[PDB]
Amino acid sequence: GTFQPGCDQLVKCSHERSVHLFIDSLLNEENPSKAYRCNSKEAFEKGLCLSCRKNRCNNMGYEINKVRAKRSSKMYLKTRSQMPYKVFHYQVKIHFSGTESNTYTNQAFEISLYGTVAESENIPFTLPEVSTNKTYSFLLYTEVDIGELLMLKLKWISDSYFSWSNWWSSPGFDIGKIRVKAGETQKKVIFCSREKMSYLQKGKSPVIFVKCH
Amino acid sequence: GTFQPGCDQLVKCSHERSVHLFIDSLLNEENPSKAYRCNSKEAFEKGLCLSCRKNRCNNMGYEINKVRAKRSSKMYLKTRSQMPYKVFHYQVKIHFSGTESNTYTNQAFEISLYGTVAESENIPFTLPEVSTNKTYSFLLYTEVDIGELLMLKLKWISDSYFSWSNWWSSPGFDIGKIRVKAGETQKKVIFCSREKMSYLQKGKSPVIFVKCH
């Protein structure tokens, strides 16, 4: 609710989204845009609140379900800057493990999504305060339909560009599992790798995870 | 003594080397070509017999030292196919160590030599029956003067060329030390690495060793 990602016509840009999000909900009858109930803006970015039970996860716009409540009801979603205003929502939980206890910060990752219908290749995200023997979670979104997930790359890129940077042996970790919980279709898949290539290292080849169970 | 690496003029090629190795010994007064005493042709290739004490390691040609013996005296050296017929001789002992007990065979290595005067970059050699917790030795020669050794790369190349070959995580080892014994100047240096990049892996970046003591 702070602003909208499209900002005299440019002056009133993010005041007409409350009409262009309703015209889209009137046009797209068969495809609703779900909105998710959370408790604060900062908690929704961590993705701890993608729960669609007990009068949560209502729709947005004309196709909303008549559900009364007892208090104020803050609900959240993300959008896109063009005329189809629907994005999907994915939760990714990552288990870090290793031996060398070394904390870092502001590391940039790149992830892919490989599914039945189509694929998403180069979604960027960052995580501060990475360390061993932890369990981190975040929120991830996209605009291409997937279906059901099959595989998932994971690449930890390098900020340095110099020809020096191939040496001074890079930090690395030992990733075991990734828990993925989809937004709309409440499926909780488990991803893992084989007993080879299970060592993510910065500026190296990415790991490749498959459907584990 | 089987043949010489240069083979009607081409018919009598390796029968005139016994004159062209003597004319070179007459011309190069200041630079003698040492020959090394061993016990068999197969043992000299392993480099177990570069020992220059107790009436061993005589010269070759006109500048030979008058030393009598009790029995037959087989002596060995290597040469080059051109008019300077002198090559140097280096012994390299490599300690393999690791965890995964997996034997291999016919693996090709590439090594470099970095010294005070000049450098030698891409000397090839092979070793059959590589495995963990062993100590292997061989013989190495070159035709460029070095002086005293400073650093030494070690690269284990990949036979495969396909774009497939980046996966199926490659075998690797944990190399601790390399003992190097020079031929003429009897110096026994010790090489090691830092506590990083000490993991030689096939088709990856090579390790770099320095003067350790």
From Swiss-Prot, chains A, B:
Instruction: Give the modified residues of type 3'-nitrotyrosine.
Output: Y90
**Cysteine pairs bridged by disulfides in the record:** C7-C13, C38-C57, C49-C52, C192-C212
Q: In which tissues is it expressed?
A: Detected in milk (at protein level).
Q: Could you tell me which residues belong to the region Interaction with GPIHBP1? A: 190-213
Q: Where does this one sit in the cell?
A: Cell membrane; Secreted; Secreted, Extracellular space, Extracellular matrix
User: What does the entry report about post-translational modification of this chain?
Assistant: Tyrosine nitration after lipopolysaccharide (LPS) challenge down-regulates the lipase activity.
Q: Which residues form the PLAT domain?
A: 88-211
Query: Catalytic center at which residues?
Result: H15 (charge relay system)
The domain of life is Eukaryota
Where is the segment annotated Important for heparin binding? 177-181
The glycosylation sites are: N31, N133
Q: Where is this region: Important for interaction with lipoprotein particles?
A: 164-168
How this chain assembles, per its entry, is: Homodimer. Interacts with GPIHBP1 with 1:1 stoichiometry. Interacts with APOC2; the interaction activates LPL activity in the presence of lipids. Interaction with heparan sulfate proteoglycans is required to protect LPL against loss of activity. Associates with lipoprotein particles in blood plasma. Interacts with LMF1 and SEL1L; interaction with SEL1L is required to prevent aggregation of newly synthesized LPL in the endoplasmic reticulum (ER), and for normal export of LPL from the ER to the extracellular space.
What the protein does comes down to: Key enzyme in triglyceride metabolism. Catalyzes the hydrolysis of triglycerides from circulating chylomicrons and very low density lipoproteins (VLDL), and thereby plays an important role in lipid clearance from the blood stream, lipid utilization and storage. Although it has both phospholipase and triglyceride lipase activities it is primarily a triglyceride lipase with low but detectable phospholipase activity. Mediates margination of triglyceride-rich lipoprotein particles in capillaries.
State the family it belongs to: Belongs to the AB hydrolase superfamily. Lipase family.
- Protein name (database record): Lipoprotein lipase
Give the species this sequence originates from: Bos taurus (Bovine)
Q: Which gene encodes it?
A: LPL
